[PDB]
């Protein structure tokens, strides 16, 4: 595979972007907001970005949205391990991350379990259609609020503590530019 597995495939890059896709999306980065942000970072920092999607253990299946933390424990464990691997395998890399829909639940569940040292390496996180928005009060638990930017479109009910999917939930491509600028700013 060429895209989505750049941390595992190496070589180390100055910037490592870790992303968790939305339910039903195939691959590692998905086919919507993940590639959109990854590519914007690659254009802004030519040759210095490695994009890594959370998979294959995170299957992005629909049923997992109803589990306690909004996703599977396997997906959370996989994501957590990828953050830890980035810091160990590439000591000089700066991490930026993102999630979309169920992917944001993966990000919240994984990052809140990370040590302070690893969290300090994560400069910024963008969450599109944050399914844990209401439950986490617009942030990621046990992580700085200023390092997270949440994109919850008007009418996207998953940000209101429900799993109801409406049209606004698929309007995030229009926010990928702002999200990419945010991540670059945090770096």
Look up 169 and say whether it is catalytic: yes
Q: Which residue in the list 72, 101, 175, 180 is annotated as catalytic?
A: 101
Q: Which residue in the list 5, 23, 64, 156 is annotated as catalytic?
A: 156
Distance CA 117, CA 181 (A): 25
Look up 174 and say whether it is catalytic: no
Distance CA 69, CA 62 (A): 14
Look up 48 and say whether it is catalytic: no
Q: Which residue in the list 169, 174, 178, 181 is annotated as catalytic?
A: 169
Resolution (A): 1.8
Distance CA 95, CA 112 (A): 15
Residue 9 CA to its chain's centroid (Å): 19
Residue 29 CA to its chain's centroid (Å): 9
CATH number of 1-187: 3.40.50.1820
Deposited experimental method: X-ray
Tokens representing 10 are 């190496």
Angle between helices 102-111 and 73-89 (to 10 degrees): 60
State the DSSP code for 102.
H
φ, ψ of residue 52 to 5 degrees: the values are: -130, 120
Beta-carbon contacts of residue 15 (< 8 Å; ≥ 6 apart): 41, 45, 48, 49, 50, 93, 94, 95, 96, 187
Domain assignments of the chain as residue spans, ordered by start: 1-187
Residue with tokens 């503590």: 161
């Amino acid at each position: 595979l060429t895209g989505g597995d750049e941390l595992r495939d190496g070589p180390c890059k100055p910037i490592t972007f870790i992303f968790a896709r939305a339910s039903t999306e195939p691959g590692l980065l998905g086919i919507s907001t993940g590639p959109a942000v990854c590519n914007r970072l690659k254009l802004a920092r030519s040759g210095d970005v490695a994009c890594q999607g959370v998979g294959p253990r995170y299957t992005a299946d629909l049923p997992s949205n109803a589990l306690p933390e909004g996703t599977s424990q396997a997906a959370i464990a996989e994501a957590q391990g990828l953050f830890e691997q980035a810091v160990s395998k590439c000591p000089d890399t700066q991490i930026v991350a993102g999630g979309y829909s169920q992917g944001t639940a993966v990000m919240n569940g994984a990052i809140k379990r990370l040590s302070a040292d690893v969290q300090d390496k994560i400069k910024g996180v963008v969450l599109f259609g944050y399914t844990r928005n209401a439950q986490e009060r617009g942030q990621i638990a046990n992580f700085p609020k200023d390092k997270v930017k949440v994109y919850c479109a008007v009418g996207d009910l998953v940000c209101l503590g429900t799993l109801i999917v409406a049209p606004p939930h698929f309007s995030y491509l229009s926010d990928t530019g702002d999200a990419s600028d945010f991540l670059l700013s945090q770096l």
